[PDB]
Ligand binder design. Sequence first.
Ligand code: HEM
Ligand SMILES: C[C@]12CC[C@@H]3c4ccc(O)cc4CC[C@H]3[C@@H]1CC[C@@H]2O
Length: 451
Amino acid sequence: PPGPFPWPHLSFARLARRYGDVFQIRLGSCPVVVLNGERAIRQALVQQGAAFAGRPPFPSFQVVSGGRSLAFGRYSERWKVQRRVAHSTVRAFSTGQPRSRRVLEQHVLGEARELVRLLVRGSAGGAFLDPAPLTVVAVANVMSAVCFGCRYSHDDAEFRGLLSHNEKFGRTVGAGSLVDVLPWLQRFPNPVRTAFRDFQQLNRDFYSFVLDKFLRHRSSLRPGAAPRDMMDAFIHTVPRLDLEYVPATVTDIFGASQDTLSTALQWLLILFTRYPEVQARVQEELDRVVGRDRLPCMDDQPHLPYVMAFLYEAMRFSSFVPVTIPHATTADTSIMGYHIPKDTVVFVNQWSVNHDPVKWPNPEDFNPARFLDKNGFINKDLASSVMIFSVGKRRCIGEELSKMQLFLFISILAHQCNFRANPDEDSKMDFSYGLTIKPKSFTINVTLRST
Ligand code: HEM
Ligand SMILES: C[C@]12CC[C@@H]3c4ccc(O)cc4CC[C@H]3[C@@H]1CC[C@@H]2O
């Protein structure tokens, strides 16, 4: 592999155009490999998936979910069991339990209507507002209903703690990651360390919060009649797994859906405002198939080719998850002719797959018609090649869950309201990097619409 190069996610694409699809970088102490091409990634993660299905052993990882995290657990024989049930259980709720689709669809509807309420009221007359704090609230409330059944009221005190948990979490994860590349920072006092502690105590305070919900759920109506929410489904579905694994995976299912689905909606909104033509086409397609007397539902998703095309290309354009969770090699392997030793950290650049000019002819241009190939004038299945949920054995287990969720959100948001940009904000979607690519602070005006 090309020798370690010294110094965002765009920098990785700069070196791939010059030093090859695969190369090494020095991250302080640890050396790391980078995969940038769809060829180098599909090869490593799909073909040789079992070889790249590992995670680095980091300080940030273990405290999460009480050292039993699915997202940060090492590749092990018991981990494989943790995923199989985790993937199967979550798949059960999103699609397959006609009830869970309903129980989920009800929770998405409810919070989605609360969203247009607070969005319109906040834009009374000609007022503009920042939708970022509303998207995080809608995401946190919905996922609480999926994990714990109870969809709290926005003023509920316990719900205020969840919101307060996500904030500090996203604000201190940076320190938790700095220790992973600068482990000596813990050898003396400094602000990063003082923050790393706050991050580790957070995942303890929050795991106990979820462990409680588990106990109070377990010793409650146990005929097995129906899973109220994700918690029961995990209990019903239980090498051997310690019973403590059920709440450990739910702590990940919650923490995972937060920052991404929020950013997802933030992009879907700021895009409606910067491209009013496509917003119209989206708006036309809902009135034509669904009508004006009822709200959209999932059973219309097949009959809504453009709405999803807008979704799939919003994910491609933003690529708000530019780099996946760092992988580690399970054994020695070779990719593109290079030797790869074991226990080596390897990043996966999803941004390079979504902006490779050969694949996507005009990469930096927002055009949802890509996934609509007019010869059939129906949605084309190229979406599967959009890299945002990753690939292989560590791919997101909530892919088919967040697709329905987001589909129901923008379809309700666009079926009821008209999103206008702010004329003073200089257009030009400016990005805020780190975690996921959130669009830097913006404001929009949301008004109802008629037909
Ligand atoms: C827009 C929505 C989402 C995006 C873009 C997203 C993205 C990702 C990414 C980049 C990874 C790491 C893949 C890798 O390491 O190769 C991942 C893994 C994961 N996701 Fe998400 N995610 C989303 C929503 C969700 C949801 C809704 C859930 C749960 C219902 C979830 C749970 C997880 C878990 C548990 C993992 C770890 C899987 C593993 O390590 O084997 N995510 N996702
Ligand atoms: C790491 C990300 C933010 C933190 C998310 C998280 C946060 C906590 C957790 O226990 C699991 C996960 C898995 C999905 C993670 C996301 C995948 C991409 C995003 O950057």
